A paper describes a structure:
FKBP12 proteins are members of the FKBP PPIase (peptidyl-prolyl isomerase) superfamily and catalyze the cis-trans isomerization of proline imidic peptide bonds. The immunosuppressants first bind to their respective immunophilins, FKBP12 (12-kDa FK506 binding protein) and CypA (cyclophilin A), which subsequently bind to calcineurin in a groove between the CnA and CnB subunits. The immunophilin-immunosuppressant complexes inhibit calcineurin serine-threonine phosphatase activity, blocking the dephosphorylation of downstream targets, such as the human nuclear transcription factor NFAT (nuclear factor of activated T cells), involved in T-cell activation and interleukin-2 transcription, and the fungal transcription factor Crz1 (NFAT homolog), implicated in virulence, stress response, and thermotolerance. To this end, we characterized high-resolution structures of the Mucor circinelloides FKBP12 bound to FK506 and of the Aspergillus fumigatus, M. circinelloides, and human FKBP12 proteins bound to the FK506 analog APX879, which exhibits enhanced selectivity for fungal pathogens.
The FK506 analog APX879, substituted on the C22-ketone with an acetohydrazine moiety, was hypothesized, based on our structural data, to introduce a steric clash with hFKBP12-His88, potentially benefiting fungal selectivity. Crystals of hFKBP12, AfFKBP12, and McFKBP12 bound to APX879 diffracted at resolutions of 1.7, 1.6, and 1.9 Å, respectively. The FKBP12-APX879 structures showed minimal structural variations compared to their FK506-bound counterparts (Cα-RMSDs, ∼0.5 Å), maintaining similar H-bond patterns (i.e., 4 to 5): two with the backbone of residues Gluh/ArgAf/GlnMc55 and Ile57 and two or three with the side chain of residues Tyr27, Asp38, and Tyr83. Interestingly, when bound to McFKBP12, the APX879 acetohydrazine moiety adopts a third conformation with a C21-C22 dihedral angle of −92° leading to a ∼130° flip compared to FK506-C22 ketone (McFKBP12-FK506 C21-C22 dihedral angle, ∼32°). The adoption of this conformation prevents steric clashes with McFKBP12-Tyr88, positioned ∼3 Å away from APX879-C60 when overlaid with McFKBP12-FK506. Altogether, the crystal structures suggest that the flexibility of the acetohydrazine moiety compensates, at least in part, for the bulkiness of the amino acids at position 88. The affinity for APX879 was reduced by ∼40-fold for hFKBP12 and McFKBP12 (KD, ∼120 nM) and 100-fold for AfFKBP12 (KD = 462 ± 23 nM). McFKBP12 also showed peak doubling, not seen when bound to FK506, for an increased number of residues located in the 40’s, 50’s, and 80’s loop (Ser39, Arg41, Arg43, Arg48 to -50, Arg52 to -53, Arg56 to -60, Arg83 to -84, Arg86, Tyr88, Leu91, and Glu103) when bound to APX879, while no peak doubling was observed for AfFKBP12 when bound to either ligand.
Residue numbers in the entry: 2 to 108
The structure:
Protein backbone atom coordinates (compact mmCIF):
# COMPACT_ATOMS: atom_id res chain seq x y z
CA UNK A 1 1.83 -3.21 -0.88
CA UNK A 2 0.00 0.00 0.00
CA UNK A 3 1.34 3.41 -1.01
CA UNK A 4 0.00 6.45 0.84
CA UNK A 5 -0.16 9.59 -1.29
CA UNK A 6 -0.72 12.64 0.88
CA UNK A 7 -3.33 15.19 -0.19
CA UNK A 8 -4.59 17.05 2.90
CA UNK A 9 -3.09 16.56 6.38
CA UNK A 10 -4.90 15.26 9.43
CA UNK A 11 -4.36 16.44 12.99
CA UNK A 12 -1.08 14.52 13.22
CA UNK A 13 -2.06 13.10 16.62
CA UNK A 14 -4.94 10.62 16.34
CA UNK A 15 -4.05 7.54 14.25
CA UNK A 16 -6.25 4.42 14.15
CA UNK A 17 -4.97 1.29 15.86
CA UNK A 18 -5.84 -2.35 15.28
CA UNK A 19 -9.35 -2.98 16.59
CA UNK A 20 -10.51 0.64 16.34
CA UNK A 21 -13.66 1.57 14.49
CA UNK A 22 -13.15 4.21 11.81
CA UNK A 23 -15.47 6.46 9.83
CA UNK A 24 -14.08 7.17 6.36
CA UNK A 25 -15.32 8.71 3.13
CA UNK A 26 -13.79 7.09 0.06
CA UNK A 27 -13.81 7.24 -3.72
CA UNK A 28 -12.50 4.03 -5.28
CA UNK A 29 -11.01 4.16 -8.77
CA UNK A 30 -8.93 2.17 -11.21
CA UNK A 31 -5.43 3.36 -12.12
CA UNK A 32 -6.64 5.85 -14.75
CA UNK A 33 -9.09 7.44 -12.32
CA UNK A 34 -12.22 5.60 -13.51
CA UNK A 35 -14.47 5.35 -10.45
CA UNK A 36 -15.78 1.93 -9.41
CA UNK A 37 -17.49 3.02 -6.15
CA UNK A 38 -17.85 5.97 -3.79
CA UNK A 39 -19.30 6.54 -0.33
CA UNK A 40 -19.46 10.26 -1.16
CA UNK A 41 -21.99 9.45 -3.90
CA UNK A 42 -24.14 7.81 -1.20
CA UNK A 43 -24.13 10.87 1.08
CA UNK A 44 -22.76 8.85 3.98
CA UNK A 45 -19.25 7.73 5.03
CA UNK A 46 -18.23 4.10 5.43
CA UNK A 47 -17.67 2.62 8.90
CA UNK A 48 -15.72 -0.52 9.83
CA UNK A 49 -13.38 -2.06 12.35
CA UNK A 50 -9.81 -1.62 11.15
CA UNK A 51 -6.82 -3.95 11.35
CA UNK A 52 -8.79 -7.16 11.97
CA UNK A 53 -9.37 -8.53 8.46
CA UNK A 54 -12.86 -7.02 8.05
CA UNK A 55 -11.78 -4.96 5.01
CA UNK A 56 -9.16 -5.43 2.31
CA UNK A 57 -5.60 -5.56 3.57
CA UNK A 58 -4.64 -2.26 1.92
CA UNK A 59 -7.17 -0.57 4.22
CA UNK A 60 -6.02 -2.53 7.29
CA UNK A 61 -2.41 -1.48 6.66
CA UNK A 62 -3.00 1.94 5.12
CA UNK A 63 -5.75 3.51 7.24
CA UNK A 64 -3.56 3.13 10.34
CA UNK A 65 -1.09 5.52 8.67
CA UNK A 66 -3.65 8.39 8.60
CA UNK A 67 -4.66 10.90 11.27
CA UNK A 68 -8.16 12.22 11.85
CA UNK A 69 -9.10 14.70 9.14
CA UNK A 70 -6.49 13.48 6.66
CA UNK A 71 -7.31 12.99 3.00
CA UNK A 72 -4.98 10.66 1.10
CA UNK A 73 -4.87 8.15 -1.72
CA UNK A 74 -4.37 4.53 -0.63
CA UNK A 75 -2.88 2.85 -3.70
CA UNK A 76 -3.15 -0.92 -3.27
CA UNK A 77 -1.50 -3.63 -5.31
CA UNK A 78 -3.77 -6.59 -5.99
CA UNK A 79 -2.29 -8.68 -3.17
CA UNK A 80 -3.53 -5.91 -0.85
CA UNK A 81 -6.98 -5.78 -2.50
CA UNK A 82 -8.92 -8.39 -4.50
CA UNK A 83 -6.00 -10.47 -5.75
CA UNK A 84 -6.24 -13.07 -8.47
CA UNK A 85 -10.02 -13.41 -8.30
CA UNK A 86 -10.98 -9.74 -8.58
CA UNK A 87 -14.52 -8.75 -7.63
CA UNK A 88 -17.28 -10.09 -9.92
CA UNK A 89 -18.81 -7.45 -12.18
CA UNK A 90 -16.59 -4.72 -10.71
CA UNK A 91 -12.85 -5.38 -10.36
CA UNK A 92 -10.70 -7.41 -12.80
CA UNK A 93 -8.13 -9.98 -11.68
CA UNK A 94 -4.78 -8.58 -10.49
CA UNK A 95 -6.07 -4.97 -10.34
CA UNK A 96 -4.17 -2.12 -8.71
CA UNK A 97 -6.78 -0.01 -6.94
CA UNK A 98 -6.91 3.58 -5.73
CA UNK A 99 -8.97 4.63 -2.70
CA UNK A 100 -9.08 8.37 -2.11
CA UNK A 101 -10.01 8.30 1.59
CA UNK A 102 -10.79 10.90 4.24
CA UNK A 103 -10.54 9.76 7.86
CA UNK A 104 -13.42 11.45 9.71
CA UNK A 105 -13.62 9.73 13.10
CA UNK A 106 -11.94 7.10 15.28
CA UNK A 107 -13.52 4.99 17.98
C1 LIG B 1 -18.25 -9.84 -0.12
C2 LIG B 1 -18.93 -9.28 0.88
C3 LIG B 1 -20.24 -8.54 0.52
C4 LIG B 1 -20.89 -7.78 1.72
C5 LIG B 1 -21.54 -6.51 1.09
C6 LIG B 1 -22.17 -5.51 1.78
C7 LIG B 1 -22.34 -5.47 3.32
C8 LIG B 1 -22.73 -4.34 0.92
C9 LIG B 1 -21.75 -3.14 0.93
C10 LIG B 1 -22.54 -1.80 0.96
C11 LIG B 1 -20.84 -3.27 -0.36
C12 LIG B 1 -19.43 -2.60 -0.29
O1 LIG B 1 -19.56 -1.21 0.03
C13 LIG B 1 -19.02 -0.83 1.30
C14 LIG B 1 -18.70 -2.60 -1.71
O2 LIG B 1 -17.40 -1.98 -1.45
C15 LIG B 1 -16.67 -1.84 -2.72
O3 LIG B 1 -17.47 -1.16 -3.66
C16 LIG B 1 -15.44 -1.02 -2.38
O4 LIG B 1 -15.35 0.14 -2.66
C17 LIG B 1 -14.26 -1.70 -1.59
O5 LIG B 1 -13.40 -2.29 -2.13
N1 LIG B 1 -14.25 -1.58 -0.10
C18 LIG B 1 -15.31 -0.82 0.70
C19 LIG B 1 -14.72 0.08 1.79
C20 LIG B 1 -13.64 -0.52 2.57
C21 LIG B 1 -12.60 -1.27 1.84
C22 LIG B 1 -13.09 -2.18 0.73
C23 LIG B 1 -13.56 -3.54 1.33
O6 LIG B 1 -12.85 -4.21 1.99
O7 LIG B 1 -14.92 -3.95 1.01
C24 LIG B 1 -15.38 -5.03 1.78
C25 LIG B 1 -15.17 -6.36 0.83
C26 LIG B 1 -15.87 -6.41 -0.54
C27 LIG B 1 -14.33 -7.44 1.34
C28 LIG B 1 -14.06 -8.73 0.52
C29 LIG B 1 -14.92 -9.85 1.05
C30 LIG B 1 -14.58 -11.14 0.35
C31 LIG B 1 -13.11 -11.49 0.46
O8 LIG B 1 -12.86 -12.63 -0.31
C32 LIG B 1 -12.22 -10.34 -0.02
O9 LIG B 1 -10.86 -10.65 0.28
C33 LIG B 1 -9.90 -9.82 -0.41
C34 LIG B 1 -12.57 -9.04 0.65
C35 LIG B 1 -16.91 -4.92 2.16
C36 LIG B 1 -17.09 -3.82 3.23
C37 LIG B 1 -17.48 -6.32 2.68
O10 LIG B 1 -16.83 -6.62 3.87
C38 LIG B 1 -19.02 -6.10 2.96
C39 LIG B 1 -19.88 -7.47 2.91
N2 LIG B 1 -19.80 -8.31 3.83
N3 LIG B 1 -18.93 -8.13 4.95
C40 LIG B 1 -19.14 -9.10 6.01
C41 LIG B 1 -20.23 -10.16 5.80
O11 LIG B 1 -18.48 -9.07 6.98
C42 LIG B 1 -16.34 -3.23 -3.25
C43 LIG B 1 -15.51 -3.11 -4.56
C44 LIG B 1 -17.61 -3.97 -3.50
C45 LIG B 1 -18.53 -3.98 -2.33
O12 LIG B 1 -19.78 -4.45 -2.79
C46 LIG B 1 -19.89 -5.86 -2.73
Amino acid sequence: GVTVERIAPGDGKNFPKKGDKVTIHYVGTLENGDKFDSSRDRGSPFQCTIGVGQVIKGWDEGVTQLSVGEKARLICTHDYAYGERGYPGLIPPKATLNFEVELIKIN
